[PDB]
């Protein structure tokens, strides 16, 4: 059963000497003179305007939403006599503080709909007669999910912020009749700034509008409550608006919240400090509070193992993240090469062991013990990895795959080794399969070099999205045709003993044996020609699918995702090995910039000829 | 350890009755009235303002850079009392002539930073009280390298030129208190015009700005010192700004310095002279001083065997270079065909020798001696080539490759011939390999024809950039799979005795022999199917890599690089054979154009309907 509308000129109301529909008609018309006589009736039968009779059936909406949803040029004259009458009624459950009691509109205020109708005088009239701005609206429609809903943080002030209402925000934020506290929050736990970073998008102009609303609100907060700082207040998720806007991966609002500058007044409420400019070069101290890797939950670790959004790589390229990333990589490239050397010597010992085994006995025993210990060490490394990042396979199936190959290579080689300790055979297929998956596994380390990295990040995503599709559309029809030909032939002794020569005939080297002894030479031939034409058809469909991506690809994204994949290396690399915990090198410099304020900053030296020339007349 | 900033509002200073920090604070505020009493203290303890106490720690920067880096609307009132006080101090090491003694800012002046702050009154105040404009600043930051640096030629005047400061250039160039000589130079050896051609780029508008600054400076030089000519002054590299801008290959500034015209006054300071115009056709005498091939270091030889920049071919197409190139090619096409005939008859004799050898003895001896002498002559030709152009393989690996094929063909055929004189065999593989590399080597001569040239320049670059990548990603995994299958099979007697049928199976003609005797039929089959899928994957990655270039290619560049490759033929062809030195034909005509001036000019007849119509109203 669908939820009813909160208002209609056609769908009146359900039910789930004046009357209720009489009151609804007289408030919907806006005439204020048929309201007379109602007060004496209300005193006569001892009833309230929020009581169960005159209210709505399922939504429970009282008459004031009907009042404010009929505002002729934003004006209704009916609200004030209703407020005066209900004040004369003497009601504990205040009509001004009415909330919609439906599940779909839980706690919805008259004030919210007054904000949505954008009549500043009606909002002023509600707040001057005893409203409350701390009435959240926690219906599931008001939350964020897929479909027809609208999330804005459930607060009247936040709803005022989402709809450009500068004047209304000012008339709410400091009126002495009910102060609208800026650091109030929602039922989800988010603040108003978290609501602004939630409602954003990736378009150039909506983002700019949210930015203008955001820094207007931040200057207003700096003027109102300078003792508290709105930037670091964390939600029920424990996130700053920086961290939350990172987690939902909105590119432009992250860019503005990272780098920004306010001169003169509002100067300590910024995260960029210019040190010296000299022609085209410019050195400015960027802030790095709560973004350095030293802290427990940085923006780096959030953008590494929490975000699910394909703009993530364009998160990374912008300063000051990439400079700090390169500094960490300059610190860690030697230990990365040490891990390279460890893996290479383990691999060469494994390849030597895989040749001569089934003074030679001494080195063979050496290789046996060394591969056993290397497998156990690599397996414990993979176990501590998956203990740490538990949900990452449901974050990035298509980026955790080298970790999967590490894990399966280690477990399969130790399974082969314990099968060697067993008497039973089939240890050689497991050993050679472990060698093959390891030999293909020597491609994560190509992450280290830019020369193979730029050339190598382009393949894996586009191949894994469609090669699996091509293989699993083809295997089913190959099975069906093999069943068909083993039915008709009844070589072709078995189904797989047909599918083998069919697959090798697709390659073309491996011949398939037609039979001229049976009468059905032409039926077999025609069936095989049908196979040929359909295989060519699905092959051409794969080709067209790839020629989509060969024109849709943009080469800047390759550089972007290569730097991102270096980041996904360097966070794990910085965390260090499981068998030796790592002292975390504190980044940035502690420095006096404000007042008795003190921040960690970080210098970069950016040069841009284009902007510097554009300065030059 | 990172070098410190030269200025900060936060990072005060290291150290590596007034005080030093007191002086720094009072000059940074700009207040001029707490400066009193300092002179008596300076006379009391007998100290100078550039002495080791009041200076900076490592940078050594004195107080005047702190003064000029705090210029309120370009104005500071603190400079004059400091200059008066230091004049009263009686200091040999003059504060006005202070230089930063750091390595990173070696010899940096106060005047340079005054120029960068663009306050003409402060620069005037420094120069009127005893500055020096011949104080170069030769820090490594001030030179040109990769990273965060800024090169402008290290001179105050050159730094004034790089930042559009017309008024400041005029106030420096002729003030009678210290003349700024225009023909001064840097520590690298470059002039101001060399700095302007160094700082340029390929964009349309930055180049135009540098052009306007350049010819403004050149007219100013023509007015100031007409006895000297700024155009031909060579640096420590021995280059004109023409030659230097060629060597760094900046396309637009080369175009303007080549063709330019000034009417009325400043007429002899130009390189284009219009002879007669007639409708759409126009004949104008271009200058060719220091660009003809007769001189020792022309722009042609520089653009042939010194430039490392992929805009080089667009250097070539523009007039008057291409007309002079075509005239030289019209002079040399007959001797080019003579070399063609020599190589063809040598090849046909070689192919005849390669058939019947291991009256017939007479012609066989004839062919033996003739191939020996042809190989020795070609080898000495290649030796004199690599004696001449020593660094060209580190200039163009991807354009010297035909010369490499010439060299290897000659040395391999003479190695085969001396192996024939030896008793020992394997001379026939060397002979047939020399024949094959020669037969593929008959493609440089396709340079001569436009019909095969336009069709043939498109292949070599795009194929050599990625075919090597495809081959060397494939060989390693082929080796790994061969090791895998010789491990599992233990045919497959050897690793190469598996890789051969794997490679021929990739072609598909050459069968590979699976084995049904061993139990691991399915493991071998599954491993081979894994090989098939990965080989198809890397093949598709190659295909997508080539479909990048099939849309990125622009057909004008083919014509451009074909004319460039004709140029790289014709310079070497004009130099002549090693065994007969060549008289260099003087180009151009000696002619009277100026006053008692006399230049070599060169006529072209250019027609352009579009510009001629655009003239027509």
UniProtKB/Swiss-Prot annotation, chains A, B:
Reported modifications of this chain: N-glycosylated. Phosphorylated by PKA.
Name assigned to this protein: Transient receptor potential cation channel subfamily V member 2
Listed InterPro entries: Ankyrin_rpt, Ankyrin_rpt-contain_sf, Ion_trans_dom, TRPV, TrpV1-4
Ranges facing Cytoplasmic side: 1-335, 385-390, 447-467, 545-617
One Gene Ontology term, aspect cellular component: plasma membrane
Subcellular location per the Swiss-Prot or TrEMBL entry: Cell membrane; Cytoplasm; Melanosome
Record keywords: ANK repeat, Calcium, Calcium channel, Calcium transport, Cell membrane, Cytoplasm, Glycoprotein, Ion channel, Ion transport, Membrane, Phosphoprotein, Repeat, Transmembrane, Transmembrane helix, Transport
Tissue: Ubiquitously expressed. Expressed in dorsal root ganglia, trigeminal ganglia, spinal cord (Lissauer's tract, dorsal horn and dorsal columns) (at protein level).
Membrane topology (Extracellular): 412-425
Region Required for interaction with SLC50A1: start-end pairs: 1-333
Membrane-crossing segments per the record: 336-356, 364-384, 391-411, 426-446, 468-488, 524-544
GO biological process: calcium ion import across plasma membrane; negative regulation of cell population proliferation; positive regulation of axon extension; positive regulation of calcium ion import; positive regulation of cold-induced thermogenesis; response to temperature stimulus
Keyword check for Membrane: yes
Organism of this sequence: Rattus norvegicus
Primary subcellular site in the record, as a coarse category: membrane
Membrane-related topology note: Multi-pass membrane protein
Reactions it catalyzes: Ca(2+)(in) = Ca(2+)(out); Mg(2+)(in) = Mg(2+)(out); Na(+)(in) = Na(+)(out); K(+)(in) = K(+)(out)
Superkingdom of origin organism: Eukaryota
């Amino acid at each position: 059963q669908e939820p009813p509308p909160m208002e209609s000129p056609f769908q009146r109301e359900d039910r789930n000497r004046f009357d209720r529909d009489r009151l609804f008609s007289v408030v919907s018309r806006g005439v204020p003179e048929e309201l007379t006589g109602l007060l004496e009736y209300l005193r006569w039968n001892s009833k309230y305007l929020t009581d169960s009779a005159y209210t709505e059936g399922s939504t429970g909406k009282t008459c004031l939403m009907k009042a404010v949803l009929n505002l002729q040029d934003g004006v209704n004259a009916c609200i004030m006599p209703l407020l005066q009458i209900d004040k004369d009624s003497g009601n504990p459950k205040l009509l001004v503080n009415a909330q919609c009691t439906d599940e779909f509109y839980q706690g919805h205020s008259a004030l919210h709909i007054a904000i949505e109708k954008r009549s500043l005088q009606c909002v002023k009239l509600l707040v001057e007669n005893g409203a409350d701005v701390h009435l959240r609206a926690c219906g599931r429609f008001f939350q964020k999910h897929q479909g027809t809903c609208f999330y804005f943080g459930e607060l009247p002030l936040s709803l005022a912020a989402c709809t450009k209402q500068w004047d209304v925000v000012t008339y709410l934020l400091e009126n002495p009749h009910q102060p609208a506290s800026l650091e109030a929050t929602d039922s989800l736990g988010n603040t108003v700034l978290h609501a602004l970073v939630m409602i954003a998008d990736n378009s150039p102009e909506n983002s700019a509008l949210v930015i203008h609303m955001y820094d207007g609100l931040l200057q207003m907060g700096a003027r109102l409550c300078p003792t508290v700082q709105l930037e670091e207040i964390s939600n029920h998720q424990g996130l700053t608006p920086l961290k939350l806007a990172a987690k939902e991966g909105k590119i432009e609002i992250f860019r503005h919240i990272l780098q920004r500058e306010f001169s003169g007044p509002y100067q300590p409420l910024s995260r960029k400090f210019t040190e010296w400019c000299y022609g085209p070069v410019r050195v400015s101290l960027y802030d790095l509070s709560s973004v350095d890797s030293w802290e427990k939950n940085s923006v780096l670790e959030i953008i590494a193992f929490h975000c699910k959004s394909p703009n993530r790589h364009r998160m990374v390229v912008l300063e000051p993240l990439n400079k700090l990333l390169q500094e960490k990589w300059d610190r860690l490239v030697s230990r990365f090469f040490f891990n390279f050397a460890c893996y290479l010597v383990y691999m060469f010992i494994f390849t030597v062991v895989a040749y001569h085994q089934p003074f030679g006995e001494s080195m063979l025993l050496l290789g046996h013990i060394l591969i056993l210990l290397g497998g156990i060490y690599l397996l414990l490394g993979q176990l501590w990895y998956f203990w740490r990042r538990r949900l990452f396979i449901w974050i990035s199936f298509m980026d955790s795959y080298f970790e999967i190959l590490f894990l399966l290579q280690a477990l399969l080689t130790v399974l082969s080794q314990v099968l060697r300790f067993m008497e039973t055979e089939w240890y050689l297929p497991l050993l050679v399969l472990s060698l093959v998956l390891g030999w293909l596994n020597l491609l994560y380390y190509t992450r280290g070099f830019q020369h193979t990295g730029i050339y190598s990040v382009m393949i894996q995503k586009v191949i894994l999205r469609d090669l699996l599709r091509f293989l699993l559309v083809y295997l089913v029809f190959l099975f069906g045709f093999a069943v068909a030909l083993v039915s008709l032939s009844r070589p072709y002794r078995s189904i797989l003993d047909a599918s083998l020569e069919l697959f090798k005939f697709t390659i073309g080297m491996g011949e398939l044996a037609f039979q001229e002894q049976l009468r059905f030479r032409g039926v077999v031939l025609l069936l095989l020609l049908a196979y040929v034409l359909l295989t060519y058809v699905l092959l051409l469909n794969m080709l067209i699918a790839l020629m989509s991506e060969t024109v849709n690809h943009v080469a800047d994204n390759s550089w972007s995702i290569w730097k991102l994949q270096k980041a996904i290396s360097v966070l794990e690399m910085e965390n260090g090995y499981w068998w030796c915990r790592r002292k975390k090198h504190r980044e940035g410099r502690l420095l006096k910039v404000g007042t008795p304020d003190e921040r960690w900053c970080f210098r970069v030296e950016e040069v841009n000829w284009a902007a510097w020339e554009k300065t030059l007349p």
